[PDB]
Design a protein around this ligand. Structure first.
Ligand SMILES: [Zn+2]
Length: 100
């Protein structure tokens, strides 16, 4: 756990091959380069992974709702985008309980 004042943000447009819909999304560069980032496409109402560094969904045992419950974001129809640079310990716990 640490803190810094050098966590800028960048915009990236991705073409949704699902509904052939394109949209731009801005997220923390630190969270994207070193962390998990989720973006929702304003057409098919759905979040997609762009850069997984925390391997949160890689555990195929966590839902998008859980990730929000860990952060605090109560609203989901607000921005439809979330960034993670340092996942909690309560989450990883459920991913590391069977193996000990
Ligand atoms: Zn889409």
């Amino acid at each position: 756990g640490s803190h810094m004042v050098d966590k800028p943000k960048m915009m990236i447009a991705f073409t949704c091959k699902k509904c052939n819909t394109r949209s731009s999304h801005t997220m923390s560069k630190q969270a994207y380069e070193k962390g998990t980032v989720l973006i929702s496409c304003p057409h098919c109402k759905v979040r997609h992974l762009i850069a997984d560094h925390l391997k949160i969904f890689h555990d195929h045992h966590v839902t998008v709702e859980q990730l929000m419950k860990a952060n605090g974001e109560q609203v989901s129809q607000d921005v439809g985008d979330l960034e993670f640079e340092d996942i909690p310990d309560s989450l990883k716990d459920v991913l590391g309980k069977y193996a000990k």
